[PDB]
Ligand binder design. Structure first.
Ligand SMILES: [Cl-]
Ligand SMILES: [Cl-]
Lengths: 370, 407
């Protein structure tokens, strides 16, 4: 015979509730489903050129190709309204990752040990909770106030901070809330992080996907010595999540977080980096994508916002991202044939996440069915 | 002011000795000749098949494969890989034991290694790993607080596993036996009989066998590759492989793992690996479809070209044996590397493989890798995949270098 082989504690406690939960589907967080949103043609053709050259099939540096890091550094400068802020973004502090999902893993596991906690918004993109449970880090939720435009309850969060608290995480613009934070509110967050002396992690992957001529405020656009780790990429706004490319950018002017940066660098060695074809294709086109491409998608999202309004169930209208928030029992009865998502999944019972990114013809039929 | 932010223990102990090596610039006027590089794309002499390249083109232009794949891999590629590995099995039953349900698509074999070990072991466990070895097993183990417990390969018995010594290393915390076959850095290609013995060893000790078979297509001299798949056994085996080396595209970051477990004693291991793919959420969707379209269509001819190039590189290293300069070596039967054994008693001022590496580089601007990096001092890893003109020139400098330091 042969002794049964069991798995590790690490594997056993690694759970993704969304995926575990798994016809008109308003539950899907992937902009490629219908084809109404499209990757820019120049990116598609840069990929064609790059793979046909045969010059980008070799090993990249595990931290990312130099030129893509440089380009990403240059690209994020546009979110900075000032020269000093812009100069504070250095390519040396850019890391290319296998999607933002990996950037989250690297950020959290280079920073925390088992037994630590981080403060994370609720409701939230579930990956932070999943990564935390996987590695024995506590995901300590602070709550977002839906009646104050889904702003962070900074009064409450203060009471959650202790000696094992290692970071403060925000998602802005937000999946699942569709929120877009004001400049003053982002300033408060930074001050909060200063008062409590913890780094700020800002998931800014929807940066290009603000609606209604809204203003996006990146944690980069401030004069502060508070270390900030910005996570972003092209997966959502260039409609190519399956390419598995994203990045993290550290802004640390007084250099208080250098070991974190080194730790993240060292940990890229484990899977040894990112698809070399996509890295070069994005390095060639990231700065050349015209406002019009981002402007077509934003208009397409504004349409979905209009369709959900007919239901008015209450809701805070979306200012950004691809979702609106409007609980488990309601979800189950709808399928028995429309698919929504319960906010339970995201850390806040009593809501439903619905997607804005599908065609009106699909949405209208589903909103009517609701 | 602001509290200094420090890193985790996991980060602090994560080290890759190869990268770290990257070395004093040479005080020489000769051209830099690098024999240290483990990337088949370096010179352009070896080539990704055109049919794979044009499948990538069709796939990306379609705009139908830019979405999220399943974290475990696209269904069609998993089915295709399963079908592909069947050719390494000589029988219907062995072929039937390969199931696409037990294939996982990974971000290179490097991720496959992470998933295999961290889904199996807890901190405080150990695994048996060959030395010398591709450094990633050691790097991942140390990163995760798993002990990399070396058993030694024998350069005089064709770089075979010393199984007798390995037996004394097994204890209650030993969780796996790792082999690399064909081998980086040794160039060895195991006989069927040795692979049979390795499996028997794993049966006696009741530990799973992990086999890095990424050089499966790159056997030389009409050799026979024996996959751990090609056996009638209930020993659980996890095979790591991919297209990175033999289709000359390591940078695309695609590889896979295949679990073969006929009595289903390792289902939890499989479920664990699957769960852990959720953390980076999978693999480049363009390449998975491109490879799904072409993996079964690539002609034998594309590979025999690469093999021919490697056999020629091997002949050039053989020239080192014609001079009495203290270099012995088992000619490579596979993979892309050779291990040069140093007779240190030949040299007046060369104490170690490391010192040999430094002085060679400083004096002749030829870069090899000391075997220390791979877990076995007293050797040098040299690459066979470069063009003959590069190798021939570099071997001349090595010969000259040895004669000069002798006595
Ligand atoms: Cl990782
Ligand atoms: Cl991973």
């Amino acid at each position: 015979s042969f002794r049964r082989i069991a798995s590790s504690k690490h594997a056993q406690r690694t759970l993704q509730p969304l995926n575990n939960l798994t016809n008109l589907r308003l539950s899907i967080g992937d902009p490629t489903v219908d084809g109404n949103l499209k990757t820019p043609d120049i990116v598609t053709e840069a990929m064609v050129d790059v793979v046909r050259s045969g010059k980008f099939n070799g090993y990249p540096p595990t931290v990312g190709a130099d030129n893509l890091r440089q380009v990403v550094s240059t690209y994020w400068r546009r979110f900075c309204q000032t020269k000093s802020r812009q100069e504070a973004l250095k390519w040396e502090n850019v890391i290319i990752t296998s999607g933002v999902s990996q950037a989250i893993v690297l950020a959290l596991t280079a920073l925390c040990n088992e037994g630590d906690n981080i403060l994370v918004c609720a409701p939230s993109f579930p990956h932070y909770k999943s990564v935390c449970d996987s590695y024995g880090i506590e995901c300590r939720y602070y709550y977002l106030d839906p009646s104050k435009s889904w702003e962070c309850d900074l009064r409450a969060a203060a009471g959650m901070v202790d000696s094992h608290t290692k970071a403060f995480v925000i998602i802005n613009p937000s999946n699942p809330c569709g929120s877009n934070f004001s400049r003053a509110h982002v300033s408060d967050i930074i001050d909060f992080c200063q008062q409590h002396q913890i780094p700020l992690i800002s998931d800014e992957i929807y940066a290009e996907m603000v609606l209604n001529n809204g203003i996006f405020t990146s944690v980069a656009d401030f004069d502060t010595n508070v270390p900030r780790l910005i996570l972003g990429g092209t997966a959502k706004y260039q409609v190519c999540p399956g390419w598995r490319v994203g990045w993290s950018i550290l802004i640390d002017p007084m250099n208080v977080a250098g070991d974190w940066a080194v730790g993240m660098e060292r940990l890229t060695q484990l899977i040894a980096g990112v698809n070399s074809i996509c890295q070069e294709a994005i390095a060639r086109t990231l700065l050349k994508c015209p406002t019009e491409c981002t402007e077509h998608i934003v208009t397409q999202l504004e349409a979905g916002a209009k369709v959900y309004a007919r239901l008015l169930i209450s809701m805070e209208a979306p200012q950004a991202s691809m979702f609106v928030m409007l609980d488990m029992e309601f979800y189950e009865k709808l399928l028995d044939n429309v698919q929504v998502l319960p906010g339970e999944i995201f850390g806040m019972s009593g809501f439903l996440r619905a997607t804005v990114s599908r065609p009106s013809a699909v949405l209208n039929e589903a909103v009517d069915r609701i």
